[PDB]
């Protein structure tokens, strides 16, 4: 008999947007950067 608080945290969580960011690069190119980023700079 206490169903009145269903989703209270979802309802009262402050809302923030997703901002603008940059288009995420996909496909073979996506594998390119996560392959080449693990040896050159590190050492």
């Amino acid at each position: 008999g206490s169903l009145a608080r269903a989703g209270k945290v979802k309802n009262q969580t402050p809302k923030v947007p997703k901002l603008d960011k940059k288009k995420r690069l996909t496909g073979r190119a996506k594998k390119r950067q996560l392959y080449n980023r693990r040896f050159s700079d590190n050492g």
Binding site: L3, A6, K8
Partner: protein, 48 residues
């Protein structure tokens, strides 16, 4: 597929403490009463 009869809060087990929001469903295929959990934060309000 079934028809919602009403909504009920079910106690969690003893180590936990929560009121899981479930619904009582009358199955149209047979006519059996079952209890189905409603996932999501405020999804019980989403069902009449």
């Amino acid at each position: 597929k079934g028809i919602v009869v009403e909504k009920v809060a079910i106690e969690a087990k003893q180590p936990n403490s929560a009121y899981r929001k479930c619904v009582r469903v009358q199955l149209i295929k047979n006519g059996k009463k079952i209890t189905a959990f409603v996932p999501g934060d405020g999804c019980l309000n989403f069902i009449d």
